[PDB]
Amino acid sequence: DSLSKSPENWMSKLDDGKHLTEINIPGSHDSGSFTLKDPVKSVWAKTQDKDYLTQMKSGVRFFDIRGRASADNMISVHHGMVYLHHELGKFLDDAKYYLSAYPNETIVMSMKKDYDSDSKVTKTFEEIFREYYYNNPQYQNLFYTGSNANPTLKETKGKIVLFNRMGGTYIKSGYGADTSGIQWADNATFETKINNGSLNLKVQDEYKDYYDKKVEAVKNLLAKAKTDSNKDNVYVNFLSVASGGSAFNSTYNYASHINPEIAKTIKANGKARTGWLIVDYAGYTWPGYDDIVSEIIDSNKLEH
Numbered sequence: 001d002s003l004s005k006s007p008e009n010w011m012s013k014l015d016d017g018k019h020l021t022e023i024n025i026p027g028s029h030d031s032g033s034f035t036l037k038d039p040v041k042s043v044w045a046k047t048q049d050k051d052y053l054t055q056m057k058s059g060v061r062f063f064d065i066r067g068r069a070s071a072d073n074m075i076s077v078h079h080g081m082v083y084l085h086h087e088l089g090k091f092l093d094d095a096k097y098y099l100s101a102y103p104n105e106t107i108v109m110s111m112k113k114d115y116d117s118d119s120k121v122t123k124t125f126e127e128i129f130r131e132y133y134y135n136n137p138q139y140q141n142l143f144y145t146g147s148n149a150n151p152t153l154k155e156t157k158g159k160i161v162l163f164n165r166m167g168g169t170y171i172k173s174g175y176g177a178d179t180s181g182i183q184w185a186d187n188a189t190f191e192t193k194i195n196n197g198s199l200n201l202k203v204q205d206e207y208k209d210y211y212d213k214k215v216e217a218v219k220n221l222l223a224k225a226k227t228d229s230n231k232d233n234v235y236v237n238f239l240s241v242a243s244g245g246s247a248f249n250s251t252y253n254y255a256s257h258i259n260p261e262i263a264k265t266i267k268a269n270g271k272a273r274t275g276w277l278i279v280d281y282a283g284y285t286w287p288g289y290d291d292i293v294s295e296i297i298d299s300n301k302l303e304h
């Protein structure tokens with residue numbers, strides 16, 4: 001009866017009546033850094049080792065896309081300064097390709113300008129994205145354009161939904177899609193209203209935390225999500241941290257220690273509300289250890 005035995009289609013099995021906030025959804029942090037292959041330059045920069053398409057087969061439905069405008073018509077996928085060797089449009093095609101395959105899955109694409117734009121560039125990153133990406137003919141059916149604020153799965157089945165960190169946007173469909181974007185606190189657990197007071201955003205993004213204070217920070221959010229069945233609260237709980245949490249040698253190596261541990265909690269809680277977990281090294285499982293993504297998936301309640 002376990003849903004994650006087949007990660008490619010896990011959503012297609014939920015109740016399309018559910019709001020997407022009410023859906024426990026695994027995500028990858030810094031989703032497109034999988035292209036890094038210099039082991040050295042990789043110690044903190046690399047956060048994933050699969051590609052989008054596998055992340056997807058693997059069960060990942062929240063992607064943390066970091067972008068930089070390198071052209072008025074182009075958004076580069078970056079990790080700060082570090083160009084990650086593809087274009088925004090690399091992600092969108094693979095995703096378009098993928099929903100196209102598993103049409104009853106939905107993806108939440110977060111889009112945050114991680115770096116200043118190149119000198120040629122003139123249009124703002126939001127401008128750049130509203131114009132040449134969201135409002136583009138090629139991606140026309142893919143982006144949820146829906147009127148709703150608490151979008152249902154039924155509504156967004158087959159659509160890339162926006163979790164927008166671009167700031168104020170002239171886009172009206174997705175999460176915090178409105179003129180005042182989403183205020184995000186630097187390095188903190190914090191709460192805000194988005195999409196014009198329709199939804200509350202409760203985030204744990206304490207990315208600077210030392211390793212034990214990180215872990216306590218995710219558990220804290222997870223203990224909030226668990227006992228909150230309000231549709232109008234969205235939870236995004238970042239399991240990723242800087243510097244290995246000051247406890248480890250590499251983001252990979254840090255990853256190896258948080259995920260399994262967080263996985264144990266989630267599993268302890270059984271079928272409860274957990275919100276959206278953003279993990280480094282999504283879909284990587286160490287022999288013996290619980291898998292955070294799988295547990296995320298199996299924490300959902302599906303059929304009575």
Ligand SMILES: O[C@H]1[C@H](O)[C@@H](O)[C@H](O)[C@@H](O)[C@H]1O
Pocket residue numbers: 029030205207238240242
């Ligand atoms: O380095 C951090 C980390 O990538 C977080 O996941 C992101 O939310 C922050 O914006 C960023 O400053």
